[PDB]
Structure 1
Amino acid sequence: IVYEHTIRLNKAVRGKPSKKAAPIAIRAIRAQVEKLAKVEDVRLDPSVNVFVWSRGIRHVPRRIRLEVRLEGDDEHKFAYVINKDVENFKHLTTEKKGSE
């Protein structure tokens, strides 16, 4: 079961100090993916961390498209999240594809 979802980093770094924005975005992506996959363990590919940190600590990209693959099951169920580049986030919405 693979989920393709957008997360608005600008909304998740809101209310927090701008210096603590890129690490705060990483923590937010991890929590959001937990409430999408319904898992407890989230691994993020370094590609996600290169995208989030692309514009520096203060400015995070406005939106991230992420591919969550629920690799791991049988009492482990980790989630592997990869960045999927998209020209624009137009009518993009969560797309749960496939089954275990």
Structure 2
Amino acid sequence: IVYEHTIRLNKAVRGKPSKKAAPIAIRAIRAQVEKLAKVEDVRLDPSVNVFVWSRGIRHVPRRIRLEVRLEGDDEHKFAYVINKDVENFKHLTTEKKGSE
């Protein structure tokens, strides 16, 4: 089950100090995946970390698209969030790739 969702990180740091933007952004990615995944464990590929910090700790990209897979077993289902680089974030919305 591979969810495909975009997240606007500009909307995430709204209300928080610019110096801690990228750390706040990473937390938002964990929290906003948890809402989609419905499972608590979220592990983000190092690629997701590099993208959020591409333009520094104060000017995180305005939007990031993440492909998240829910692979897990023995009740510890976890979501593995990767970074999908998109030229256009225009007509982009949840695009789950099937189930199980």
Please report how far the alpha carbon of residue 74 of structure 1 lies from its aligned counterpart in structure 2 after TM superposition: 3.2
Q: Which runs of 4+ in 1 moved over 6 A?
A: none
Please report how far the alpha carbon of residue 32 of structure 1 lies from its aligned counterpart in structure 2 after TM superposition: 0.2
Q: Which residue of 2 aligns with 1:80?
A: 80
- For structure 1, the residue ranges without an aligned partner over 5 or more in a row are none
Please report how far the alpha carbon of residue 45 of structure 1 lies from its aligned counterpart in structure 2 after TM superposition: 0.1
Whole-Å separation in 2 of the counterparts to 1:95 and 1:45: 20
Q: Deviations over 1:3-61 (max 9, x none)?
A: 00000000001100000000000000000000001001000000000000000000010
Aligned residues: 100
Whole-Å separation in 1 of the counterparts to 2:74 and 2:93: 29
- For structure 2, the residue ranges without an aligned partner over 5 or more in a row are none
Whole-Å separation in 2 of the counterparts to 1:99 and 1:93: 17
Please report how far the alpha carbon of residue 71 of structure 1 lies from its aligned counterpart in structure 2 after TM superposition: 1.1
Please report how far the alpha carbon of residue 80 of structure 1 lies from its aligned counterpart in structure 2 after TM superposition: 0.1
The alignment's TM-score, normalised by the length of structure 2, stands at 0.98
Whole-Å separation in 1 of the counterparts to 2:88 and 2:18: 25
**What root-mean-square deviation, in Å, do the aligned CA atoms of Structure 1 and Structure 2 show?**
0.6
Whole-Å separation in 2 of the counterparts to 1:29 and 1:47: 13
| Identity across matched positions, percent | 100
